[PDB]
Design a protein around this ligand. Structure first.
Ligand SMILES: Nc1nc2c(ncn2[C@@H]2O[C@H](COP(=O)(O)OP(=O)(O)CP(=O)(O)O)[C@@H](O)[C@H]2O)c(=O)[nH]1
Ligand SMILES: [Mg+2]
Lengths: 59, 179
């Protein structure tokens, strides 16, 4: 069975920053690790004011 | 490798952001600017195995309605954090917070998170508004809603002190999942 019980889910331990979005009234969003699938939804949703160009790619 | 889709839903100021952090970081933040989008993944011991908890933080606003639902598709349970020291949230909580979800998924589990304890334990404010227009919510009053909205369960939490903090998420996942 896959029944979880109040005594099953132990204490957390594995903080995984899957994505970090840092807004800023002077810079406007400081996302440097958004999700892969969300990357397309974000730039398409509210972050569609302009493609992602935060710092050019290092050759 | 199992993973839960715990997304925090709610519109207002119920310390939903800080409670999310202290839960996974076991520490109280300091900076102020976390309301946008933050996906956290925890590793808890569920069913005798290191499971993964997909934590998705929303914006809790209307201006971000565009990239808001983005966290709805891949969801299992919902974290409706309502301010206990604010009847306003409670009213909508039963007719605004959950309904907004029912229209999309009226079958998925619904966690009833109670935040804003630090204040709830501050008679100075509680008594201040208790007779001016506002008033705190009792566990029995919150429970009812937990049942009125088919909520998996009602559990409060904090962040600064961690008063039943994680204990709440333990109820969420437990709900998001199933036999
Ligand atoms: N003492 C204490 N302060 C808390 C706790 N949780 C949040 N706060 C404080 O309350 C303030 C607001 O927290 P925040 O989580 O951003 O509130 P919110 O409900 O998310 C508000 P919004 O919907 O605008 O994004 C911050 O100053 C934060 O430090 C807590 O458990 N204890
Ligand atoms: Mg917030």
């Amino acid at each position: 069975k896959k029944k979880i019980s109040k005594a099953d889910i132990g204490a957390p331990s594995g903080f995984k920053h899957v994505s970090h979005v840092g807004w800023d009234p002077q810079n406007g969003f400081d996302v440097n690790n958004l999700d892969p699938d969300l990357r397309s939804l974000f730039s398409r949703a509210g972050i569609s004011e302009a493609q992602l160009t935060d710092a050019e790619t290092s050759k | 490798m199992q993973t839960i889709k715990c997304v925090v839903v709610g519109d207002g100021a119920v310390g939903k952001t800080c409670l999310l952090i202290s839960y996974t970081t076991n520490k109280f933040p300091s900076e102020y600017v976390p309301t946008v989008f933050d996906n956290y993944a925890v590793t808890v011991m569920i069913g005798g195995e290191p499971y993964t908890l997909g934590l998705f933080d929303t914006a809790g606003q209307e201006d971000y309605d565009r990239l808001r639902p983005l966290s709805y598709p891949q969801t299992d349970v919902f974290l409706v954090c309502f301010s206990v020291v604010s009847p306003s949230s409670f009213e909508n909580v039963k007719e605004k917070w959950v309904p907004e979800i029912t229209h999309h998924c009226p079958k998925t589990p619904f966690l009833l998170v109670g935040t804003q304890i630090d204040l709830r334990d501050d008679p100075s404010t509680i008594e201040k508004l208790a007779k001016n227009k506002q008033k705190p919510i009792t566990p029995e009053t919150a429970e009812k809603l937990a049942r009125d909205l088919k909520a998996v369960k009602y559990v409060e939490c904090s962040a600064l002190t961690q008063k039943g903090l994680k204990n709440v998420f333990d109820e969420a996942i437990l709900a998001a999942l199933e036999p």
